[PDB]
Amino acid sequence: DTHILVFPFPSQGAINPLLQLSKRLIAKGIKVSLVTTLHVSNHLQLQGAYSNSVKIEVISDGSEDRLETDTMRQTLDRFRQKMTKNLEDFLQKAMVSSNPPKFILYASTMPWVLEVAKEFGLDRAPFYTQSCALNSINYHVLHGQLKLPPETPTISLPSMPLLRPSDLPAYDFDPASTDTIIDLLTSQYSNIQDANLLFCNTFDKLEGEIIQWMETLGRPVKTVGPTVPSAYLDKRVENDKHYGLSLFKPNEDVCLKWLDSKPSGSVLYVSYGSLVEMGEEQLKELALGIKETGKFFLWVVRDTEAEKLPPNFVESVAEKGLVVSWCSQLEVLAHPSVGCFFTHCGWNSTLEALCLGVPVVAFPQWADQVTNAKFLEDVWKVGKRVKRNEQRLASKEEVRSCIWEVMEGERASEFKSNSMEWKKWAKEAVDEGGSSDKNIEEFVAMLKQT
């Protein structure tokens, strides 16, 4: 049996991509052990009931958890120190077992794992879960060719589209941690000389030239994305309709029946992000702008954010809008009545829109969302970004006009045609013989040779 370890960043918001990749690997005959923390094992249902199910290895005792008194630097230092010892202790045992691991695939945000693997003589590779465009930006910040505030009005990197400073990732949302955040991201490219491979959560037709640029750094690059459940793509992995490893228990849904009565391609699905907080002022303009379009809309917004909606808003859109606390985003985007997706452009949501063929109204808020939005509008051409003013407020007029332009304007047919092409190309990449399937097959072949 060929056995490997997968070690994602141990957070709910960061583990889905390699859980999905793990499922593609076990479908090809690889035995996978998920290395993780007590916290993740307690909050997620990771155990499958089958012979080839991902094996869960909890290697921590919770002492690596953040304390309320920490600066981000202190939390990161304690995590690295304790998890370095935890991984060393785990490999001490695993490397002398009956079927020792032959490789460790780890999140790119834990670059310290490479030095542990190096000491043990264990093959290893980081997984970059975000876009390949972010790899180029972060690499250029590490090597001095770019700065956190761009020193120039325009940015022309190699094999990339032109970027304005507003298109660059915004991580100054927490000004005391900005320096720590940039050091961690730039540290993901520092030790790649010793990586067996570099894995990226993207596909060749989506970021081909950037991937080719990344291949000039000296190491083989394997695109294995999009990491979206097989049911919404190639359908080659039996009932894989969710991101997790345990059996899928669907929630009671009020969204699909409502969508069933609406005309095909007519409704705007709205989500500004499951963990994004929006100010009352901005939420009011967003709400009224959607209302002014007169379109049917399905807005998913969590209970603590829903309390910030204007009074009488929900009652005022009783006819055209369904505002709910939760829906299955994949099932909503796959529904034929959904014709546009108002999104914050998180990388997960970006790939879901591309895989499901839905045009977008882009409303990025922080981090890599701004760069993803730039690509959705200006490179992939599946939608438009909401214009904000000199105070960064997107007005209700700016929200309404953007929605109308994507769904009804001169380029509306272009966006739908482009969305349909990307859906076809994303499915092709992960289906048999595709660019991502080939890379996965190549990895599995390499593992079979040890």
Ligand SMILES: CC(=O)N[C@H]1[C@@H](OP(=O)(O)OP(=O)(O)OC[C@H]2O[C@@H](n3ccc(=O)[nH]c3=O)[C@H](O)[C@@H]2O)O[C@H](CO)[C@@H](O)[C@@H]1O
């Ligand atoms: C790529 C990534 O790591 N996350 C992105 C984003 O979220 P991301 O793009 O992951 O967006 P969400 O947090 O909204 O979604 C998380 C997951 O929950 C699902 N979902 C969400 C809401 C809902 O009602 N139902 C549902 O099923 C989505 O399909 C997705 O798979 O997180 C940050 C937002 O602060 C971004 O900076 C990240 O780039």
